[PDB]
């Protein structure tokens, strides 16, 4: 397929790279659980001027 022919003659060819597939993907984060100051920013009316 890579040599692009149906008859390969004698010799050592190179096909591709190989690698070990990823197994058991892991995700990590900090432990704190405190919703950030969302309401203090939007649910207010006295927004300053530009």
């Amino acid at each position: 397929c890579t040599l692009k022919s149906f008859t390969v003659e004698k010799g050592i060819y190179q096909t591709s790279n190989f690698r070990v597939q990823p197994t058991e993907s892991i995700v990590r984060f900090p432990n704190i659980t405190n919703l950030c100051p969302f309401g203090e920013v939007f649910n207010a009316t006295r927004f300053a001027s530009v």
């Binding site: 190179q14 591709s16 790279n17 690698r19």
Partner: protein
């Protein structure tokens, strides 16, 4: 270099009377390191999209 003139004449010959057998090294490269790089992993890196 050490500037000097030869005692040339039309009836004079200078003949050696001794010899020194010397040994001289000489160094030549013959080969480079057989390197090889891979398209699909260098350019992209374990990524189907790229």
């Amino acid at each position: 270099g050490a500037e000097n003139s030869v005692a040339y004449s039309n009836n004079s010959i200078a003949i050696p009377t001794n010899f020194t057998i010397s040994v001289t090294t000489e160094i030549l490269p013959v080969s480079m390191t057989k390197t090889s790089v891979d398209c699909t992993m260098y350019i992209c890196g374990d990524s189907t999209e790229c």
